[PDB]
Amino acid sequence: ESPFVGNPGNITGARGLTGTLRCQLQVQGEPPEVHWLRDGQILELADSTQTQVPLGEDEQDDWIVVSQLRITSLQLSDTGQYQCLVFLGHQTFVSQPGYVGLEGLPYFLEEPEDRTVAANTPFNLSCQAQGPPEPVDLLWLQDAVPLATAPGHGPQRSLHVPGLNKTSSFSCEAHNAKGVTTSRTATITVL
């Protein structure tokens, strides 16, 4: 049968998060080195830690191996189906799979910038923001005031201001299933 007894679990979180996957097999004599497979391919450069515990009286009896892959600053690429692999002779063995997915608050790509415009003149501000998860609804604010009933409603990614007879400020919330992340407060200076 399959040497495994414990299969990888699942880890989902925001970018940056460090977490760990772990499988634990039991073999007969001198344990094999356990490798990690991500999306069916071999993970050549990854932080892993194998713990071997001899159950017998010699190194030729039963052993308990437990390998845990650790993902440090969780980014996008690290996303996928992960599984353990051990070679028992010319034969090969794989663990059930585990999946790791990225999922947190909105990430800004563009935020309202500071500007200094002539009075009663038109101009535009921008506000992009990616997920996952998607979709992400935007929502502007003027002098700390919503410019729409709720997120997703009103201008988004690009807000056109007809004119300003005095210095004002704009923010830009970004919402998604996880929560909300507000942008920096841009200050428009009038002359």
Binding site: A14, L105, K178, G179, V180, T181, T182, R184, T185
Partner: peptide
């Protein structure tokens, strides 16, 4: 340069402060 709030080690609010 933000201010992060989490409920159960998971973030819910990220506000930008200066």
């Amino acid at each position: 340069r933000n201010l992060v709030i989490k409920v159960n080690r998971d973030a819910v609010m990220k506000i930008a402060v200066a």
